Design a protein around this ligand. Structure first.
Ligand SMILES: [Mg+2]
Ligand SMILES: [Mg+2]
Ligand SMILES: [Mg+2]
Ligand SMILES: [Mg+2]
Ligand SMILES: [Mg+2]
Ligand SMILES: [Mg+2]
Ligand SMILES: [Mg+2]
Ligand SMILES: [Mg+2]
Ligand SMILES: [Mg+2]
Ligand SMILES: [Mg+2]
Ligand SMILES: [Mg+2]
Ligand SMILES: [Mg+2]
Ligand SMILES: [Mg+2]
Ligand SMILES: [Mg+2]
Ligand SMILES: [Mg+2]
Ligand SMILES: [Mg+2]
Ligand SMILES: [Mg+2]
Ligand SMILES: [Mg+2]
Ligand SMILES: [Mg+2]
Ligand SMILES: [Mg+2]
Ligand SMILES: [Mg+2]
Ligand SMILES: [Mg+2]
Ligand SMILES: [Mg+2]
Ligand SMILES: [Mg+2]
Ligand SMILES: [Mg+2]
Ligand SMILES: [Mg+2]
Ligand SMILES: [Mg+2]
Ligand SMILES: [Mg+2]
Ligand SMILES: [Mg+2]
Ligand SMILES: [Mg+2]
Ligand SMILES: [Mg+2]
Ligand SMILES: [Mg+2]
Ligand SMILES: [Mg+2]
Ligand SMILES: [Mg+2]
Ligand SMILES: [Mg+2]
Ligand SMILES: [Mg+2]
Ligand SMILES: [Mg+2]
Ligand SMILES: [Mg+2]
Ligand SMILES: [Mg+2]
Ligand SMILES: [Mg+2]
Ligand SMILES: [Mg+2]
Ligand SMILES: [Mg+2]
Ligand SMILES: [Mg+2]
Ligand SMILES: [Mg+2]
Ligand SMILES: [Mg+2]
Ligand SMILES: [Mg+2]
Ligand SMILES: [Mg+2]
Ligand SMILES: [Mg+2]
Ligand SMILES: [Mg+2]
Ligand SMILES: [Mg+2]
Ligand SMILES: [Mg+2]
Ligand SMILES: [Mg+2]
Ligand SMILES: [Mg+2]
Ligand SMILES: [Mg+2]
Ligand SMILES: [Mg+2]
Ligand SMILES: [Mg+2]
Ligand SMILES: [Mg+2]
Ligand SMILES: [Mg+2]
Ligand SMILES: [Mg+2]
Ligand SMILES: [Mg+2]
Ligand SMILES: [Mg+2]
Ligand SMILES: [Mg+2]
Ligand SMILES: [Mg+2]
Ligand SMILES: [Mg+2]
Ligand SMILES: [Mg+2]
Ligand SMILES: [Mg+2]
Ligand SMILES: [Mg+2]
Ligand SMILES: [Mg+2]
Ligand SMILES: [Mg+2]
Ligand SMILES: [Mg+2]
Ligand SMILES: [Mg+2]
Ligand SMILES: [Mg+2]
Ligand SMILES: [Mg+2]
Ligand SMILES: [Mg+2]
Ligand SMILES: [Mg+2]
Ligand SMILES: [Mg+2]
Ligand SMILES: [Mg+2]
Ligand SMILES: [Mg+2]
Ligand SMILES: [Mg+2]
Ligand SMILES: [Mg+2]
Ligand SMILES: [Mg+2]
Ligand SMILES: [Mg+2]
Ligand SMILES: [Mg+2]
Ligand SMILES: [Mg+2]
Ligand SMILES: [Mg+2]
Ligand SMILES: [Mg+2]
Ligand SMILES: [Mg+2]
Ligand SMILES: [Mg+2]
Ligand SMILES: [Mg+2]
Ligand SMILES: [Mg+2]
Ligand SMILES: [Mg+2]
Ligand SMILES: [Mg+2]
Ligand SMILES: [Mg+2]
Ligand SMILES: [Mg+2]
Ligand SMILES: [Mg+2]
Ligand SMILES: [Mg+2]
Ligand SMILES: [Mg+2]
Ligand SMILES: [Mg+2]
Ligand SMILES: [Mg+2]
Ligand SMILES: [Mg+2]
Ligand SMILES: [Mg+2]
Ligand SMILES: [Mg+2]
Ligand SMILES: [Mg+2]
Ligand SMILES: [Mg+2]
Ligand SMILES: [Mg+2]
Lengths: 88, 129
RNA sequence: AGAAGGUGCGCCGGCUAGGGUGAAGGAUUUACUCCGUAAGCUCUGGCUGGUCGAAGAUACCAGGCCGCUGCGACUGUUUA
RNA sequence: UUACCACGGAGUGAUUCAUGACUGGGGUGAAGUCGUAACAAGGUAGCCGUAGGGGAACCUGCGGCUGGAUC
RNA sequence: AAGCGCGCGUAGGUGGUUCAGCAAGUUGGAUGUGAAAUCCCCGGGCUCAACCUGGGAACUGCAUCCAAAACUACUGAGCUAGAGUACGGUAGAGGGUGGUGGAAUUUCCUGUGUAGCGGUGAAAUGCGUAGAUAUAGGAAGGAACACCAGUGGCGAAGGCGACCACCUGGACUGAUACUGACACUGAGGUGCGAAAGCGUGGGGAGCAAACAGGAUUAGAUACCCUGGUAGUCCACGCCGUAAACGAUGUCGACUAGCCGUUGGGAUCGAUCUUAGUGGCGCAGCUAACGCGAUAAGUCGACCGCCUGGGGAGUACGGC
RNA sequence: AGUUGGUGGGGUAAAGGCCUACCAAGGCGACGAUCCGUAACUGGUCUGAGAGGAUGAUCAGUCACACUGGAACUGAGACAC
């Protein structure tokens, strides 16, 4: 549901090596933006299970990436959790 | 998901030996290299070569002798799900000594005969006859 | 369901913890103001002894309870 | 005289054995009565789930399968 | 007899590839212990044997020290072959909310017209002179979406075909750049899940369980015919099942070929290469049928399940 | 709920919630606690090619009990066949 401009400004805001789209932080930010964006769509369309499957897949991907990042570096983990405003 | 690369090596060798081929190519590692060398010293293969360039490729040339392949029965023993280890007195015999069983010991990867020669047991990798 | 059933309760001391009101003092908006106050008055508790009687919720006051069934769902109304 | 405490009392639960008027299915029996549901295209192709109906095997509707013959 | 209907995921199990370290697993050695008896071997006694008895071996174990470093575990630093991200395109009945079309059936009204219509194996019930069927015009309403249509496509499965707009998931396809093992499976749990069914409120053309009547029949609570209610449709909630089937769990790697077909790429109608979807077939496998790169072949990782037929997927208990 | 840990004290031949007064809210559990049923354990015995399976008569080691439920005394030693 994201746009080209939205993704570009997200990666610009969260890039860590001036051209890295694969670092955990960028992917986590993109997934969080998409999850937050799809909420209002699912507010109106409660009977759309087929898309909610993809939403759950994105949630699982974000969870796994956060777990890996926490396992690797605690400081970057805490910083990312702080900026994204999510519990854990 | 390749949770056992050595079983993949032996499976490749057996499958392409059954299919009447001449060369088998696979990703290499310092354990498959030792296994290939110990097979070479036992005359079960023709030759083995390791490629350069970061992602080395190991290639093995096979033997046939008669109309039937030289290696007729090769089987992995210690898998990641079992991890079988044996002492010197309990080293298994394949075909009553007519074959060889590869053993990994603190002195390296060698044969069971050399294992008793040095008097050191270890982990039984596979049996070839 | 207060189901059923059980334990304590009087009076006199010892130690001890809290609340309200409220001099003196302090602040500034100098006055029908804010904070805060020792004593006094007043209201809640805790654990420790002693003691009298036959009996300490001592008088008046103040639910008896339980198990099976019929009828009507219930609160209500009716032959002064 | 106090403290601890066995026996023994009172109230109310849990669990587990045996037994119980009367009832529900199951199995095993022999030349019994009624039908003919399946096996062949078994004479309406059979099964699966579900619902209704009927002395009984069962019938009918809805969805599914081929483990269906002719072609 | 035996793969959960299908996913996601927790504890757990397992782990691509380089160095370096450590010594828990692993291996070797030493020491202590492992009661005696018993079992085993070599002997000695009872005239033999049973029996008794000497020495040994064994007691496959546990514990403490010493040494090794291939593999597993642990620690530090790496790498890009697994996994994922960014950028253009392709196809599609993938999902949801609204709107709009044409064919047809039925019902009502009106004109012409008169003696049959309908149905069957043959009939009858039923509809008709209170003017039917047919025929022409108008109106109302509900539902399904011919031709395209394909061994065709998409979806985790169940499943999804009129057209358009809006919201939205995934997959294929090409190059470069990026992260640097972030992976697989998964007891419990969590959701999605045909049809029939249940609750509340709408709607109701066709079809049609139950039901009524007519046939057939020895009977016909059926097959056949004429009608016909729930239901089938919509909104919200529940229910958790199917021969939910490829009767074949998910993931990864290898193994002769030939003929199609759906998307996409390259090189010069031809050749090559991917991701699906079909037909044959060599090895191999199987009790046989048969499977055979979409394995039921050769192998790995994890999970589920089976143990003669009935009783019985039933009883009791829990949810 | 003396339940888990700490402190002071008591007590024992001896460590210890063994006991007591305070302070804290801890301890155990899907590597199966708690609960229900059953049963002394081992050396050994019998079977089996072995791995296993079944099992604790006689002999030897340990434990528990002595009509049923409690309690202590004497004693180096008993909660006393
Ligand atoms: Mg009371
Ligand atoms: Mg008195
Ligand atoms: Mg009472
Ligand atoms: Mg009572
Ligand atoms: Mg009654
Ligand atoms: Mg009566
Ligand atoms: Mg009344
Ligand atoms: Mg009444
Ligand atoms: Mg009544
Ligand atoms: Mg009532
Ligand atoms: Mg009533
Ligand atoms: Mg009243
Ligand atoms: Mg009242
Ligand atoms: Mg009266
Ligand atoms: Mg009572
Ligand atoms: Mg009672
Ligand atoms: Mg009782
Ligand atoms: Mg009873
Ligand atoms: Mg009885
Ligand atoms: Mg009787
Ligand atoms: Mg039938
Ligand atoms: Mg029949
Ligand atoms: Mg039939
Ligand atoms: Mg018939
Ligand atoms: Mg049939
Ligand atoms: Mg059933
Ligand atoms: Mg049926
Ligand atoms: Mg029905
Ligand atoms: Mg029924
Ligand atoms: Mg019927
Ligand atoms: Mg029906
Ligand atoms: Mg059908
Ligand atoms: Mg399954
Ligand atoms: Mg399946
Ligand atoms: Mg499943
Ligand atoms: Mg499960
Ligand atoms: Mg599940
Ligand atoms: Mg089932
Ligand atoms: Mg999973
Ligand atoms: Mg894990
Ligand atoms: Mg590895
Ligand atoms: Mg691990
Ligand atoms: Mg290493
Ligand atoms: Mg050792
Ligand atoms: Mg001994
Ligand atoms: Mg003699
Ligand atoms: Mg060392
Ligand atoms: Mg007409
Ligand atoms: Mg018309
Ligand atoms: Mg399908
Ligand atoms: Mg339905
Ligand atoms: Mg219904
Ligand atoms: Mg309904
Ligand atoms: Mg209704
Ligand atoms: Mg109708
Ligand atoms: Mg009919
Ligand atoms: Mg009809
Ligand atoms: Mg009708
Ligand atoms: Mg009904
Ligand atoms: Mg609906
Ligand atoms: Mg289906
Ligand atoms: Mg099945
Ligand atoms: Mg079967
Ligand atoms: Mg599956
Ligand atoms: Mg598979
Ligand atoms: Mg997956
Ligand atoms: Mg796979
Ligand atoms: Mg694969
Ligand atoms: Mg074939
Ligand atoms: Mg088979
Ligand atoms: Mg077979
Ligand atoms: Mg295995
Ligand atoms: Mg496995
Ligand atoms: Mg496996
Ligand atoms: Mg049985
Ligand atoms: Mg039986
Ligand atoms: Mg049985
Ligand atoms: Mg049941
Ligand atoms: Mg029973
Ligand atoms: Mg039940
Ligand atoms: Mg205390
Ligand atoms: Mg002390
Ligand atoms: Mg103490
Ligand atoms: Mg237990
Ligand atoms: Mg006993
Ligand atoms: Mg045997
Ligand atoms: Mg034995
Ligand atoms: Mg024996
Ligand atoms: Mg025993
Ligand atoms: Mg005895
Ligand atoms: Mg003894
Ligand atoms: Mg002892
Ligand atoms: Mg003893
Ligand atoms: Mg002892
Ligand atoms: Mg004793
Ligand atoms: Mg006695
Ligand atoms: Mg006696
Ligand atoms: Mg006694
Ligand atoms: Mg005494
Ligand atoms: Mg005395
Ligand atoms: Mg004494
Ligand atoms: Mg004693
Ligand atoms: Mg005595
Ligand atoms: Mg005694
Ligand atoms: Mg004694």
């Amino acid at each position: 549901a994201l746009s080209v401009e939205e993704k570009a400004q997200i990666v610009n805001e969260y890039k860590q090596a001036e051209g890295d789209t694969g670092s955990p932080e960028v992917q986590v930010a993109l997934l969080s933006a998409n999850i937050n964006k799809l909420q209002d769509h699912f507010k109106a369309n409660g009977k759309d299970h087929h898309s909610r499957r993809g939403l759950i897949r994105m949630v699982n991907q974000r969870r796994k990436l956060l777990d890996y990042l926490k396992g690797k570096d605690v400081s970057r983990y805490t910083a990312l959790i702080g900026r994204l405003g999510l519990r854990r | 998901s390749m949770q056992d690369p050595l079983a993949d090596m032996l499976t490749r060798i057996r499958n392409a030996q059954m299919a009447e081929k001449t060369v088998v190519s696979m990703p290499s590692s310092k354990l498959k290299a030792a296994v290939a060398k110990v097979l070479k010293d036992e005359g079960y293969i023709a030759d083995f070569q390791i490629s350069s360039e970061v992602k080395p490729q190991l290639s093995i040339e096979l033997k046939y002798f008669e109309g039937k392949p030289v290696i007729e029965e090769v089987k992995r023993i210690s898998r990641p799900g079992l991890r079988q280890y044996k002492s010197v007195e309990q080293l298994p015999k394949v075909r009553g000594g007519l074959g060889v069983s590869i053993v990994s010991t603190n002195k390296g990867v060698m044969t069971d005969r050399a294992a008793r020669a040095a008097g050191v047991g270890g982990e039984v990798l596979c049996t070839v006859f």
